[PDB]
Design a protein around this ligand. Structure first.
Ligand SMILES: O=P(O)(O)O[C@@H]1[C@H](OP(=O)(O)O)[C@H](OP(=O)(O)OP(=O)(O)O)[C@@H](OP(=O)(O)O)[C@H](OP(=O)(O)OP(=O)(O)O)[C@H]1OP(=O)(O)O
Ligand SMILES: Nc1ncnc2c1ncn2[C@@H]1O[C@H](COP(=O)(O)OP(=O)(O)NP(=O)(O)O)[C@@H](O)[C@H]1O
Ligand SMILES: [Mg+2]
Ligand SMILES: [Mg+2]
Ligand SMILES: [Mg+2]
Length: 317
């Protein structure tokens, strides 16, 4: 049997989407799925972790990525989502750098790197309706993102013509994803990316790749709108149908390969007749789509068979 090892925190390994996909991968005649226990991941040396021939492993809060890296170096499995790139995905500066290198449209942006010992010495000038970051001007509205991609406290600053103030976004809590603040001045501690505000129809397109030739997309109300979350009777956030155009399918292909994340989520802003990537999240499954579960499991199983069947002497077509 070809062994597919799943190495992530229990919140992710035991999530409904994961269980749905793993039960389908297990239907492959020659594949056995082994899910690494969280206590093993956290507390056992990598020399004691189960063997696998193919490793599906990804970082989330609390995950020891150094250990996953060392395990992959020790056992040299076929890796679905590259582990070293998951360090880079944690830093928005690195993500935007890669997007640019790949010719991928993204918002105009500038990085404000601030010395926490000398926070006033950074290259920021503030006016009432703009900032200048390293000399580069952003007229309001503009967006201010923590350099850490794991920090979801993204702020939007409104122009005086709109009443000023700001929208403070955050990881959703029940009914809300953002709140208005009367504060018009930018944050004065921390490092940020400042970027131009892309006007959309008030929705975000969320894209989910399974390899570079498959992507599911769906739309959700932008948290930047009023911050009330649309929920169904099951308490799931409301999603809207999307079909990606030819340009956007290429974007997905590029993102998947550039970040070496077979399973990869990222966000698109449909604005001004083009589509701009504003965030790359790495490993993420679509939730609540039976067809995606089927498709994702089939594609992953096929990738495993295509790579490893010859060395196992298993016929595969
Ligand atoms: O980006 P999408 O596709 O919306 O997935 C996120 C997911 O949103 P949803 O389940 O509503 O789609 C987020 O779930 P959450 O916002 O809690 O959803 P809900 O309000 O239904 O409980 C998840 O956050 P966490 O579980 O609280 O850490 C959030 O986790 P994060 O990646 O932001 O933080 P992590 O916990 O991974 O460090 C995401 O889960 P993932 O992509 O499966 O990891
Ligand atoms: N340049 C922009 N112009 C307009 N809206 C933006 C822009 N950047 C971000 N947004 C909006 O703000 C939301 C959050 O920003 P995003 O860069 O996705 O932060 P995040 O903290 O990485 N979210 P997550 O997808 O949960 O990891 C997006 O989904 C958009 O609705
Ligand atoms: Mg099986
Ligand atoms: Mg996002
Ligand atoms: Mg993100």
């Amino acid at each position: 049997q070809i062994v597919v090892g799943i190495c992530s925190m229990a919140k992710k390994s035991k999530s409904k989407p994961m269980k749905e996909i793993l039960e389908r991968i297990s239907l492959f005649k020659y594949i056995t799925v082994v899910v690494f226990e969280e206590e093993v991941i956290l507390n056992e040396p990598v020399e004691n972790w189960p063997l696998c021939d193919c490793l599906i492993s990804f970082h989330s809060k609390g995950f020891p990525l150094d250990k996953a890296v060392a395990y992959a170096k020790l056992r040299n499995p076929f890796v679905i989502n590259d582990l070293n790139m998951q360090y880079l995905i944690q830093d928005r500066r690195e993500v935007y750098s890669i997007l640019q290198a790949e010719g991928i449209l993204l918002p105009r942006y500038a990085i404000l790197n601030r010395d926490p010992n000398n926070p006033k010495e950074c290259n920021l000038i503030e006016g009432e309706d703009h900032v200048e970051v390293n000399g580069e001007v952003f007229q309001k509205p503009f967006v201010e993102k923590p350099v850490s991609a794991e920090d979801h406290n993204v702020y939007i600053y409104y122009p005086t013509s709109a009443g000023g103030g700001s929208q403070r976004l955050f990881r959703k809590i029940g009914s809300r994803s953002s709140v208005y603040s009367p504060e018009s001045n930018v944050r004065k501690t921390g490092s940020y990316i400042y970027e131009e505000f892309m006007p959309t129809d008030g929705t975000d397109v969320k894209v989910y790749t399974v390899g570079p030739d498959y992507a599911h997309a769906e739309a959700r109300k932008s948290p930047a709108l009023d911050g009330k979350v649309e929920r169904d009777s099951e308490g799931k956030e409301v999603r809207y149908p999307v079909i990606l155009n030819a340009r956007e399918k290429l974007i997905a292909w590029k993102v998947c390969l550039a970040f070496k994340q077979t399973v990869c989520g990222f966000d698109l802003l449909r604005a001004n007749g083009q589509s701009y990537v504003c965030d790359v999240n790495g490993f993420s499954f679509v939730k609540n789509s039976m067809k995606y579960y089927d498709d994702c499991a089939k594609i992953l199983g096929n990738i495993v068979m295509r790579e490893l069947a010859p060395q196992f002497h298993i016929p595969w077509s």
